[model samples]
Target: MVNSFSGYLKLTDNVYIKNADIVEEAKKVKPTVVVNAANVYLKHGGGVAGALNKATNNAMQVESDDYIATNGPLKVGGSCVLSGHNLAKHCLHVVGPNVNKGEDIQLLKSAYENFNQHEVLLAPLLSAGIFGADPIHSLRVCVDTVRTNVYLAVFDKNLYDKLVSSFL
Candidate 1:
């Protein structure tokens, strides 16, 4: 049986595990790259000045570069910080599943399908399920589902290849 997938797609059949504060993980690893997965209602997660606040404080001490959303070498987005990650050089915090409802992709509302937020930027993260959930949708949602601008799963060669093959 073929296990594992490539590139940008939903993570079906692949076990999804809840991440325990990506910021903490980033600090521990001090990675060169950060991947933000799509999610919803970010403001409530940890609020802007949370772990991310602390992480950014630490990044300044180490003088590391950020890849995710950052205003400067040691500063991250106030809105994004609420996603519950430490303030690292970079991080990828995906949007949400609650979108508006409409027939067209652009018109589609959260009630219908897509995130509830407007002018939402689509970035391909490590994993976003078909439903935009972790593990599941990250491994299952069709690549064409959204216009992926920021690529997140570059480190995963298998996933990257699959995303390239699926892009039409």
Candidate 2:
């Protein structure tokens, strides 16, 4: 049951709870860049971004603000990349749209497309952990959009197994 994009992108299912030590998992994948489901304000207030902020000692927020200062607020479906600041090589923070909307998938796709780096850790974007949207849907969109080494972090066991099997 190999995925159609298997050769172009690598997929992984990370089943730890939210706020767990994802940095370690990211390290195992050897990602050049890790992504965050950020907001227009670029603050790592909660969700995946918050955990990354704690791990990076708020360096992610500082870099995010600096990016916003220079580029202005990130629009929904838009993203900004920051130096990993000792966390990873880089961090791609994307502003995800609100949940329960029909356009969320496209917005997530756009956000993933915003970062061009090949090795990326694709965090749960607009998923139930953060934005109440279907995690599987977001994963599908990410798998389809990303054209390089991609490590997908999934918390739910059922979804994780599904994703892993899908890529088998």
Candidate 3:
């Protein structure tokens, strides 16, 4: 193993990957669009959602609840753009496909593709973590589909260490 390192990786002309706390990083970057791998029902219950909810003084969750009440739940590979309260002008919530159900790569790619339309897309590891998809694979799809003007965040240090050697 290569121990660990601190810095970001430039995966494309404008796509960059950084290993850090996404919540803190989100505030620092002032990204126009922030990507959250949200659930099908769009609840800000845990993980990045929970962190952001707290950061935004619970306004994010309140808005999410109201949005779903009108629009209904998102399907796998679906996305919802929220007017976040405190950080990131807009938060893009994407529902990642469940690998435990069956094949999910195609859907994951679609989720990543959603970021492609934004000017400054602050992305995270969607379809990985609780979604059950492997980290390496999800990161690969992110670099491939959301190609330009993206700054990705990775919170897990071990995961970042492994990725540095493999992807760098």
Off by over 4 Å in 2: 1-21, 27-30, 100-104, 115-122, 125-128, 162-168
Can you write out model 3's per-residue Cα lDDT over 41-139, one digit (the tens) per residue?
Answer: 877777777787789898888888899899999888989888856777899998888787684668998887778677677778887877789888987
**lDDT of every predicted structure (CA atoms):** 0.32, 0.62, 0.78
What lDDT tens digits, residue by residue, belong to model 2 across residues 44-108? 88777888788888887887778778888988888777787666777777766667554455577
Clashing pairs in 2: none
TM-score per candidate, chains pooled: 0.30, 0.73, 0.89
Relative to the true structure, candidate 1 reaches a TM of 0.30
Q: How well does candidate 1 match the true structure, expressed as C-alpha RMSD?
A: 12.0
For candidate 1, lDDT tens digit of each residue in 1-168? 221222334433222222234454455544433444322322212322234445565442232223233433211111132222343334434443322321122211221123212222222332223332333234334233433322233334554556444423
Question: CA shift at 54, candidate 3, in angstroms?
Answer: 1.8
- Top TM-score prediction, candidate number: 3
Per-residue error at 115 for model 2, in Å?
4.3
